[PDB]
């Protein structure tokens, strides 16, 4: 269960999302989520 965002994502929004993911799923899932996000970000850049 994750929200769907239709607005611009910035550094503060990313930090908030990472904190909420650490709170909900824990650091273990957040590590893989962050790796996938980094891969997608590099690809799109």
């Amino acid at each position: 269960n994750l929200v769907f965002h239709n607005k611009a994502i910035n550094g503060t929004a990313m930090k908030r999302l990472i904190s909420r993911l650490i709170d909900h799923f824990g650091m273990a899932y957040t590590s893989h989520i962050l790796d996938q996000v980094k891969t997608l970000g590099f690809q799109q850049a």
């Binding site: 980094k38 590099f42 690809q43 850049a45």
Partner: protein, 63 residues
């Protein structure tokens, strides 16, 4: 003929009488797959197999 003051020979890091400490290479400013994160450069193999940035270094040892 050469006057008193003209250049007879060209030393290291100097060509045509002007200081030359580098090379001219084609450059593009874009991110490439993370290889440019922070400051980092992605370079091609042409600089390697054409000796563009080859240098000679001499170290001495004495006893």
């Amino acid at each position: 003929c050469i006057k008193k003051g003209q250049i007879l020979a060209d030393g290291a890091a100097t060509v045509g009488g002007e200081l030359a400490l580098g090379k001219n290479v084609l450059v593009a400013y874009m991110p490439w797959e993370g290889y440019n994160s922070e400051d980092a450069v992605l370079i091609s193999e042409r600089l390697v197999y054409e000796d563009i940035y080859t240098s000679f270094h001499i170290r001495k040892y004495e006893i």
